[PDB]
Every structure is written in structure tokens, then in C-alpha cells.
């Protein structure tokens, strides 16, 4: 992505980010999903009953086709967050319809973002 190739020409950065999900399945497919974000400096949740407590958003792709979440604020240099996808409800399908689908991730940055020091990149060609 263009955020993670332009952040290799600098050393320090800080700000918020943006992630947008998109579902590509049949028209008559229904179900629910759960997306959560664990703040920096913690442990990855082991069950969905624990990820339900923090920051999250439910998503029913049978009624909506795209959902978005915003990370509050991150700042690294030169231990930094995690996001998980959980099942909540199975995937329902009528007869004579495929039983597979796919998702896209579509990451991006926000309006509060700064770069503070110049250096040469390392991922040569």
C-alpha cells in the first residue's frame, strides 16, 4: 500500500489510520460478523466473549456491503496494536447457490499524519 512504502523514506510518524472492508458474495447470502481492535500493549483475545468487551463493531453483510472502522491514534518510531475477525452466526445460503465468498481489506491513512525525518529506503527494487 502507498502508506507503507512512503513511510520507509522517513523515520518518525504519528496519527490515525483507516480500514474499509468489502464483501463480494451472492445477492441472497446473509450472515453476521464481528471486528475488534485491541489497543497497543496488551494480549490477543482468545475468545469472542473477551473481544466483545473492548472496542468493536458488528456487521451484517446481508444488509450492508461495506463497513469501516477508525483507529484512534498510533505513534511508532524507526507491541503496536492488533485487529481480529470473528464469526458470529454461520453463513446462510438458499439452494442452488455457491457456498464461498471473499473479502477485501482496503487500508488507508487519515488527515492527522506527519513525517519528521528523512532517510534512504531499504527495500531496493
Amino acid at each position: 500500500t502507498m502508506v507503507g512504502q512512503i513511510c520507509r523514506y522517513y523515520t518518525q510518524w504519528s496519527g490515525s489510520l483507516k480500514v474499509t472492508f468489502m464483501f463480494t458474495g451472492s445477492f441472497m447470502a446473509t450472515g453476521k460478523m464481528l471486528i475488534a481492535y485491541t489497543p497497543p500493549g496488551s494480549a490477543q483475545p482468545a475468545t469472542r466473549e473477551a473481544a466483545m468487551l473492548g472496542t468493536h463493531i458488528v456487521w451484517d453483510f446481508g444488509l450492508q456491503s461495506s463497513v469501516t472502522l477508525v483507529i484512534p491514534w498510533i505513534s511508532n518510531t524507526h507491541a503496536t496494536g492488533i485487529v481480529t475477525i470473528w464469526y458470529q452466526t454461520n453463513f446462510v445460503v438458499p439452494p442452488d447457490t455457491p457456498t464461498e465468498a471473499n473479502i477485501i481489506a482496503l487500508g488507508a491513512a487519515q488527515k492527522n499524519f506527519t513525517l519528521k525525518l528523512c532517510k534512504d529506503t531499504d527495500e531496493i527494487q
Binding site: V58, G62, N90, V92, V93, P94, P95
Partner: protein, 195 residues
């Protein structure tokens, strides 16, 4: 949508006031129903569980929503009811055990739906603040519930104000190739809580 306010009055008196999504239950062709005691369903989860078990006294209202997820090739119908002071009886030791009386957040499956497991015809369980779910009309239902009680400011670990009951009147049925279990989801949101 078509929200129903029980008895026409709201309770009227951030961290502990948020949506709690409960476990999903599977609906099959053979099924009886489920029920949940509502002063306790949240006596083990979140901050609300902590301050309910610590403080002596409790009062609150509630808002409940039930969601379905099916297709246009399925058929069925459900009933959602709320019963103040839902006492569960035992058929013939004259003493139901702890599990049926105080189920966890997952609830307990009905044993004899016809008499509502309490010798109640279930043909008259519509005076209660009910709602209907038909698989061809809609897939949602919302209910408001004030704090009904004789003596104000009662316990939260020794009392049960009311209960919520879901029962399939018409049986689920489908054709070959379709998923054999529509899921059902329940959510709660404490409103105007005190301790």
C-alpha cells in the same frame, strides 16, 4: 420500526450503559423454545456484573432486541413474550433444581411448551407485552420494559423481576440444499440503572 412500549410508561429513573450481544441460538425443525431470567442474565458479565454483586440494592429498566437471519426459501413463525414474575414449576419432588430456576446468560430450553412449563395454556400468553416474528414479513422485534416491583430497591442476587420467552408456534421447514439451522441473536441495553 414497530417498537412496543410495555404498559405505556418508560422507567424514567458510557461505561455500564452499552449494548451486550448474547450467544447465538440455533433453530431446527424440532425445537421447543428458550427463556432467560432478566435481573441475572448479566450477573456474570461486564462492569454491570461487578457492581451488581457488590452493592446490596438494585433497580433498572431494560431494552431488548431479537434478530433473525434467513432467506426467502425458508418458512416459520416465532413468538416473543416478557413475563413479570415468571415462576417455573416442576412436573410429577416438588422442587426444581437451581439450573432451571437460575440459568446462565445462555438460558434454558423449554421442556413442555404447551403449558409454558408452568401450567399456563400458552393460548392466552398474549396479554403480556408480546410481539410476532414471521419469516416472510420481517426479522426484528424490540421491547421496552420498566421496573415493576411492589417494594422499591430490592436485591439483585436473590430476586427475579421478569423473564423473556421465545417459542416457535409454526415449525421450521425447508427444501433440500438449504442451510438446516437459521440463527437467532439477542441483545440487551440497560437504561436508567441505579445502585
Amino acid at each position: 420500526a414497530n417498537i412496543v412500549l410495555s404498559y405505556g410508561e418508560w422507567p424514567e429513573y458510557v461505561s455500564v450503559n452499552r449494548f451486550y450481544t448474547l450467544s447465538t441460538k440455533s433453530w431446527k425443525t424440532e425445537s421447543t423454545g428458550w427463556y432467560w431470567k432478566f435481573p441475572d442474565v448479566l450477573n456474570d458479565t461486564g462492569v454491570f456484573g461487578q457492581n451488581a454483586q457488590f452493592h446490596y440494592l438494585y433497580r433498572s429498566g431494560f431494552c431488548m432486541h431479537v434478530q433473525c437471519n434467513a432467506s426467502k426459501f425458508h418458512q416459520g413463525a416465532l413468538l416473543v413474550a416478557a413475563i413479570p414474575e415468571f415462576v417455573v414449576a416442576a412436573s410429577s419432588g416438588l422442587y426444581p433444581d437451581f439450573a432451571h430456576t437460575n440459568p446462565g446468560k445462555n438460558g434454558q430450553e423449554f421442556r413442555d411448551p404447551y403449558v409454558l412449563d408452568a401450567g399456563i395454556p400458552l393460548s392466552q400468553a398474549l396479554v403480556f407485552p408480546h410481539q410476532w416474528i414471521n419469516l416472510r414479513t420481517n426479522n426484528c422485534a424490540t421491547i421496552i420494559m420498566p421496573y415493576v416491583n411492589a417494594l422499591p430497591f430490592d436485591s439483585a442476587l436473590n430476586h427475579s423481576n421478569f423473564g423473556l420467552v421465545v417459542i416457535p408456534i409454526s415449525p421450521l421447514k425447508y427444501c433440500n440444499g438449504a442451510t438446516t439451522e437459521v440463527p437467532i441473536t439477542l441483545t440487551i441495553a440497560p437504561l436508567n440503572s441505579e445502585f
